[PDB]
């Protein structure tokens, strides 16, 4: 027996939001930069707005309005018009991969370190709500302020293990499309091995189509320069083979808090008006 999804949808006036700019563009479609202003209540609220893809853009929606999570995107609305809108919390920083890369010489072990425990506690939480993202890497992380990042992109999450991005996916997902919450967990793996590399590409340069047997010969990524072998194991054992023997989100959290109590043991780096933000309204 499954409990009834209560979340509500709500529907936006496409008169109450002002697209101010194009954030970004590509198949996915157009995402822009805007304010929501409801009528009425004095608030304008800064917002990202993302115009068959109706039914997959109404399946991320579904999903988004379902999660509610401090280190979860929330939704705020669709508006109805040629093409469905996602109305989405405008998160300034853009995703945590570009983030990285464009500051890696300044990204502290602390900040890394907290990441870890931030995307683990969003992740945890989708695990509660019984549902797999099967799309997290770096790119789908997206950065509020320095201090909290959180998890997007929900255009493949199902919720239940389920029966595609090849270099995040766990072995059994490559092999026999199976997905579960510890298939999510070696793409936790791989996302923060892009963090702690600031950005490198996983496997770079081999082609997607020998990943598969590249991983049953037992090689993986490699250990990041900053990263002690406490933490790389943390990453290895994302990775092992046997999904159940891979840590639980829970676990990740636990590991990963202590760490970010003394981030320089464990991570050894160089030099180591009426605006209202979404969580507010
Ligand atoms: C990693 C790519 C990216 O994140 N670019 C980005 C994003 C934001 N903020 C934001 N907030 C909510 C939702 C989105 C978003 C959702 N989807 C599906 C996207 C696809 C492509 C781009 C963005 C999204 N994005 C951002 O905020 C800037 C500001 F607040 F000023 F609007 N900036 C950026 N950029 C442009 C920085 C990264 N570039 C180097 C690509």
Redesign the pocket.
Known sequence: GEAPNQALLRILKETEFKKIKV??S?A?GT?Y?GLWIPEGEKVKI?V?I?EKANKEILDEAYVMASVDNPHVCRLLGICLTSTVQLI????????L??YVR?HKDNIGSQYLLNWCVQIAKGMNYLEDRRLVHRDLAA?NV?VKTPQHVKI??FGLAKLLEYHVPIKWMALESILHRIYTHQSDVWSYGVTVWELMTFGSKPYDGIPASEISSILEKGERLPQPPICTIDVYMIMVKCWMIDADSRPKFRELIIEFSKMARDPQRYLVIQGDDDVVDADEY
């Open positions: 954030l970004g590509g996915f995402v930069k800064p990202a993302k989405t919390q405008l998160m300034p920083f853009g995703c991969l570009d464009e790119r997206l997007t992109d």
